[PDB]
Amino acid sequence: SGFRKMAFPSGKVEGCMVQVTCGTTTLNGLWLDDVVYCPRHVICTSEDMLNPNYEDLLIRKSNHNFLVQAGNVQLRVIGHSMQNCVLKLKVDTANPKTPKYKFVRIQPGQTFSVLACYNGSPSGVYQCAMRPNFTIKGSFLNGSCGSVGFNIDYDCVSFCYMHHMELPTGVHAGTDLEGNFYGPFVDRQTAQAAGTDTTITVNVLAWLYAAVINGDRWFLNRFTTTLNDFNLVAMKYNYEPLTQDHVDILGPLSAQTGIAVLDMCASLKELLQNGMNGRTILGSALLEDEFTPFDVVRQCS
Amino acid sequence: SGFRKMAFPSGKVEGCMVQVTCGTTTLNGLWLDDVVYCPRHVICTSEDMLNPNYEDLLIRKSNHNFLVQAGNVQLRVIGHSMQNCVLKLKVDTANPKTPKYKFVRIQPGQTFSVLACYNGSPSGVYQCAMRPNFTIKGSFLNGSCGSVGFNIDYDCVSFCYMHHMELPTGVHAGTDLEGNFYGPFVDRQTAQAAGTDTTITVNVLAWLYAAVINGDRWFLNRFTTTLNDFNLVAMKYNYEPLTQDHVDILGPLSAQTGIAVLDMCASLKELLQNGMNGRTILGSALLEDEFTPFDVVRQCS
Numbered sequence: 001s002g003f004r005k006m007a008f009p010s011g012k013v014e015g016c017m018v019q020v021t022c023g024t025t026t027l028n029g030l031w032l033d034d035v036v037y038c039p040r041h042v043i044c045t046s047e048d049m050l051n052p053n054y055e056d057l058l059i060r061k062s063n064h065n066f067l068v069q070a071g072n073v074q075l076r077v078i079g080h081s082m083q084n085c086v087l088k089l090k091v092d093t094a095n096p097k098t099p100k101y102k103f104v105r106i107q108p109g110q111t112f113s114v115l116a117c118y119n120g121s122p123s124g125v126y127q128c129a130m131r132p133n134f135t136i137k138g139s140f141l142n143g144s145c146g147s148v149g150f151n152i153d154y155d156c157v158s159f160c161y162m163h164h165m166e167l168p169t170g171v172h173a174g175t176d177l178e179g180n181f182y183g184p185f186v187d188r189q190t191a192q193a194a195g196t197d198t199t200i201t202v203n204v205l206a207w208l209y210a211a212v213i214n215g216d217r218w219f220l221n222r223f224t225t226t227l228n229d230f231n232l233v234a235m236k237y238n239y240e241p242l243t244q245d246h247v248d249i250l251g252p253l254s255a256q257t258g259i260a261v262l263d264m265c266a267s268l269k270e271l272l273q274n275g276m277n278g279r280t281i282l283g284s285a286l287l288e289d290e291f292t293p294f295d296v297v298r299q300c301s
Numbered sequence: 302s303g304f305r306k307m308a309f310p311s312g313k314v315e316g317c318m319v320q321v322t323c324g325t326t327t328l329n330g331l332w333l334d335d336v337v338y339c340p341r342h343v344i345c346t347s348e349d350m351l352n353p354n355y356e357d358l359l360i361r362k363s364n365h366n367f368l369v370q371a372g373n374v375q376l377r378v379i380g381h382s383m384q385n386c387v388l389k390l391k392v393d394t395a396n397p398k399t400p401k402y403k404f405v406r407i408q409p410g411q412t413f414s415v416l417a418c419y420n421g422s423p424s425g426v427y428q429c430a431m432r433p434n435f436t437i438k439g440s441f442l443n444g445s446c447g448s449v450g451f452n453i454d455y456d457c458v459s460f461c462y463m464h465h466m467e468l469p470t471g472v473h474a475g476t477d478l479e480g481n482f483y484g485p486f487v488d489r490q491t492a493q494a495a496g497t498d499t500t501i502t503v504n505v506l507a508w509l510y511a512a513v514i515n516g517d518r519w520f521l522n523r524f525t526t527t528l529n530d531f532n533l534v535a536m537k538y539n540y541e542p543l544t545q546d547h548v549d550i551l552g553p554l555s556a557q558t559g560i561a562v563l564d565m566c567a568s569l570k571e572l573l574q575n576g577m578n579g580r581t582i583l584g585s586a587l588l589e590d591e592f593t594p595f596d597v598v599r600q601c602s
């Protein structure tokens with residue numbers, strides 16, 4: 001019936017995206033209740049970024065240097081404070097669209113939807129994974145700062161990502177909605193680089209299960225393996241060590257398919273050693289690791 | 302800055318999705334103005350599908366056999382007519398959320414966003430391409446019939462797909478919003494199969510340009526080629542013949558990058574012959590063809 005990388009419906013967030021401008025810089029903000037959250041480097045000029053003292057830079061700021069637009073509407077800024085690396089800009093109008101929302105700090109390996117915007121206008125929506133080195137591989141051009149990642153869990157909108165940075169290597173980085181960077185990064189134009197990316201093993205397994213469910217099963221073998229033995233082959237190819245809790249987490253998927261986690265770990269073992277010999281798994285010739293077990297169970301059940 | 306397969310923000314459509322039930326069957330519908338569009342096979346039982354006479358089946362229908370819910374709300378059905386392969390069910394309440402909308406019949410090779418729903422509830426959003434054989438490769442489980450594909454062009458919401466069918470081969474099929482099937486398919490449980498899928502050449506080129514823009518350029522060569530010569534290698538690998546209009550269409554992309562279409566056709570020529578030798582292009586080890594030139598220019602500019 002198909003398996004696709006898909007994003008939560010984005011309506012509940014489209015209505016929270018506004019435009020923020022300070023000096024010659026314009027980017028995006030998040031309008032919840034009477035507050036608009038955005039990245040604090042909005043107040044920085046080209047020269048400031050090299051070594052900005054944000055507290056000092058912010059004092060010199062008066063509310064009229066901050067210009068906020070809900071679509072074409074304009075919002076009145078009546079205060080501005082800093083929380084870690086995010087600008088809180090209080091406004092008169094509470095957003096009548098504010099949804100039921102949380103501010104969550106996700107875990108590496110977890111996934112969220114990103115609503116990409118340019119000048120307060122939503123552009124599109126896509127799913128990203130928080131890599132083990134606290135980066136994400138998304139689509140953030142000029143004017144994309146302020147786009148936020150989120151999950152929808154039944155009632156609630158869980159905001160987990162606000163985009164700040166791009167790294168020399170093409171990957172991305174940001175903060176939670178309290179303003180704390182994921183990873184070691186700083187909002188400063190100085191040398192910093194990601195750690196080594198390893199690969200999210202439990203997700204790859206989840207992806208193979210998803211593929212068995214959808215008819216791709218050529219990679220299934222009769223072998224079985226032990227965690228320690230597989231995890232020795234894992235370590236060779238920069239794969240996250242698998243754990244018993246990961247196996248527990250994969251329970252429902254192994255059940256729906258009739259394949260022990262450990263039987264699939266042997267199938268995975270063979271694919272790291274020998275590659276794919278020109279066959280495909282769910283339309284890839286590479287192994288994929290940005291699907292969580294939950295993401296798969298949601299779509300395959 | 303990144304290139305990702307992304308879908309239009311889905312808010313303007315989330316609010317048009319309702320639940321439809323007839324007998325023991327429940328699926329999705331599209332509530333625009335005072336009308337709810339859904340697939341007409343909703344009125345068919347297991348036995349009917351084999352050879353349904355829909356006109357006859359529909360006469361035996363009274364409005365009370367049709368049950369429609371906007372969320373938990375219920376809508377009153379005050380009429381029901383058939384238009385090709387879609388049920389039009391008039392209702393008392395005009396949707397106060399009805400957007401500015403068109404009903405467009407897209408062209409093979411063109412792309413649209415699909416808002417997947419299950420029992421009137423939106424589940425997620427993703428981008429699909431109308432294959433040259435009038436199928437799509439999406440994610441449509443039980444209760445997904447009625448999910449619609451759409452594009453957003455500035456003001457308007459262009460509805461182009463409503464999902465009806467799944468094919469023995471795992472691929473999907475449906476109608477425009479006037480109820481005309483794409484492809485040769487019929488809403489009947491009898492033998493029918495897709496034509497041979499060829500590959501959308503102009504899209505693959507667009508994808509290579511997107512990859513050059515984002516730093517992947519190992520596949521660039523010094524050679525050049527002629528359309529007829531490339532299109533001879535195209536025909537070998539079930540690739541759509543390239544045309545001068547496709548080259549015109551790729552103009553802006555070839556401009557942004559400095560690579561003549563024909564210089565890229567030679568790079569593509571080499572990749573069909575020799576494959577990728579274990580390198581990747583925008584995180585694939587395969588060539589991709591579900592990006593239009595427009596889809597790329599939108600994200601890379």
Ligand SMILES: *C(=N)N(Cc1ccc(Cl)cc1)N(C)C(=O)[C@H](Cc1ccccc1)NC(=O)[C@@H](NC(=O)c1cccs1)C(C)(C)C
Nearest residue numbers: 027141142143144145164165166167187188189190192302
């Ligand atoms: C967001 N709206 N925005 C604009 C933007 C610039 C370049 C690209 Cl490719 C896409 C969008 N961004 C990403 C920025 O304004 C940030 C601000 C910033 C944050 C931290 C340090 C410096 C600047 N610009 C950057 O991410 C820049 N990154 C860096 O200079 C560094 C990365 C690691 C160490 S320094 C650039 C290089 C993307 C301009």
Ligand SMILES: *C(=N)N(Cc1ccc(Cl)cc1)N(C)C(=O)[C@H](Cc1ccccc1)NC(=O)[C@@H](NC(=O)c1cccs1)C(C)(C)C
Nearest residue numbers: 001328442443444445446465466467468488489490491493
């Ligand atoms: C939509 N809500 N819905 C349910 C559904 C069934 C199976 C799967 Cl895998 C996913 C969802 N669908 C797809 C249907 O109800 C259709 C209705 C239909 C339309 C045309 C012909 C027959 C039935 N079910 C199907 O698509 C079925 N397809 C076929 O029988 C044929 C395909 C080609 C020739 S006959 C099945 C096989 C998916 C049940």
